[PDB]
Amino acid sequence: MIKLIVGLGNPGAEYTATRHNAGFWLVDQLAREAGATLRDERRFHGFYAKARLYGEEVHLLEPQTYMNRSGQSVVALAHFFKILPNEILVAHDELDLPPGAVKLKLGGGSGGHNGLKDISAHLSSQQYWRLRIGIGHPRDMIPDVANFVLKPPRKEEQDVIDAAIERALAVMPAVVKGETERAMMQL
Numbered sequence: 001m002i003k004l005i006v007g008l009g010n011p012g013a014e015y016t017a018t019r020h021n022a023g024f025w026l027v028d029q030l031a032r033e034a035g036a037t038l039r040d041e042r043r044f045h046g047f048y049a050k051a052r053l054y055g056e057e058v059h060l061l062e063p064q065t066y067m068n069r070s071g072q073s074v075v076a077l078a079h080f081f082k083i084l085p086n087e088i089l090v091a092h093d094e095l096d097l098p099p100g101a102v103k104l105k106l107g108g109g110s111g112g113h114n115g116l117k118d119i120s121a122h123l124s125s126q127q128y129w130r131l132r133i134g135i136g137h138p139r140d141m142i143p144d145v146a147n148f149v150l151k152p153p154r155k156e157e158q159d160v161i162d163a164a165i166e167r168a169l170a171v172m173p174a175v176v177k178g179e180t181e182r183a184m185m186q187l
Contacts, residue, residue: 001178003087004059008115011064020149022133023091045073054173068114071122088128097134100160102168
């Protein structure tokens with residue numbers, strides 16, 4: 001049963017529409033849906049809310065550390081509330097899935113993602129859940145990943161990513177209740 005949902009991204013107005021902020025998009029929309037207000041919480045190095053989701057108390061977090069320091073934020077909260085990696089869901093952009101795909105997975109390595117790398121380092125564990133939001137890969141369109149994720153999705157990509165995030169929001173009841181197989185079937 002998930003007690004913390006983290007969305008990954010970079011801080012500041014300039015980064016808000018970039019692919020690397022896909023996780024923030026999901027958590028922003030989840031917060032709105034739940035009537036929760038994300039507020040700056042210095043203890044957790046990011047924006048934070050204690051949300052009521054489908055009858056459960058669930059912490060929501062968007063680290064404001066820059067992507068590669070996201071672990072400082074996650075571990076501060078996890079240690080404070082005594083949350084285990086298996087009770088954490090991290091929503092992030094996934095290069096290895098196409099735009100419009102979303103998947104739920106426990107563990108699986110970082111896939112080169114610097115936010116995941118830092119979270120796994122600070123938790124001393126990769127064994128947290130991920131909501132992998134497909135953004136595609138820069139090789140896909142050919143007959144530099146660092147700069148690819150710092151651009152917004154193309155309009156046609158954004159449309160299918162938005163619909164995938166909606167599908168992910170719709171499986172949150174199953175995620176927060178620990179109904180993994182249900183969530184995967186629906187997703």
